């Protein structure tokens, strides 16, 4: 298998300098890892900050939960690798049935 040289859209990123991670009802923090043997050289993991969701006042409501949103990415190590990424959290209501 031969890998052509060049990365489409190499010039394109997502901004985390918006405080979207902190203005969310299911807010989360971030973590970075730099690993030189791979591309992207850095992988960003999110971790939900609370078990409940926060309201307009700032209080934790544990009737609802912050839960992680996850996507499988491909990262190169040359060999392909599949890594799980937590991009952020959402607020959900439990199932009552």
């Amino acid at each position, epitope marked *: 298998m031969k890998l052509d040289i060049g990365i489409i859209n190499e010039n394109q990123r997502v901004s985390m300098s918006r405080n979207i991670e902190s203005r969310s009802t299911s807010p989360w923090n971030y973590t970075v890892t730099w690993d030189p043997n791979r591309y992207p050289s850095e992988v960003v993991q999110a971790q939900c900050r609370n078990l409940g969701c926060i309201n307009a006042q700032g209080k934790e409501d544990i009737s609802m939960n912050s839960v992680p949103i996850q996507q499988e990415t491909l990262v190169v190590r040359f060999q392909l690798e599949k890594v799980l990424v937590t991009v952020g959290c959402t607020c959900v209501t439990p199932v*009552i049935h």
Partner: antibody
Amino acid sequence: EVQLVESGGGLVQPGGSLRLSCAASGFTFSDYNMAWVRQAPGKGLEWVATITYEGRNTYYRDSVKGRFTISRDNAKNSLYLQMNSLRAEDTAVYYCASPPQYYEGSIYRLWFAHWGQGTLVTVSS
Amino acid sequence: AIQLTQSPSSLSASVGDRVTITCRADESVRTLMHWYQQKPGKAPKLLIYLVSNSEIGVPDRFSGSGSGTDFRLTISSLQPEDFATYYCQQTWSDPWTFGQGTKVEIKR
């Protein structure tokens, strides 16, 4: 990815002592609370002890208070349970347990996302 | 200490049937109810967290439900490899407690 690897089980006589070890790998051991859960032969699960990330607080179940001691070395990525004055009710498989990597470790009330393979501790003369 | 009581203690169903396990608590644990699956001679594996959320690798047929004192684990199409003992757990009150176990067997 996450690996919890226990060792140090085996045979011990009543009153004797035993130190269990849990070698962690695949996550930032230094950020999360760790625990021990045990299970006596053919019975259910029973929380034993919890330790916090820095090491400052240790919580135990009533049965093991004064006898067991939970410990951690964040530099060797390792969790410990020193068991003393061992009694026949402590015959059990002892599991190391880790919380999930996708929630902040400051949260106390987290669940057990990851378990070690377990060691049998048999307390017998 | 919150005492958890699972119903039934054992049950048998044919491959493909809907199986339902119940877990009841003394006091309200709110949404801090979790479920585990333990196969013989293996460690427990997490199935459900925060009442109704599933871990990444958990099959689509496992689902959680519940409110404050009444929670339920459901297997929508029982398969042979689902033979296990299922445990509920709460992390609301400081002495963390498990249910007693429900053993799920397969009728064939």
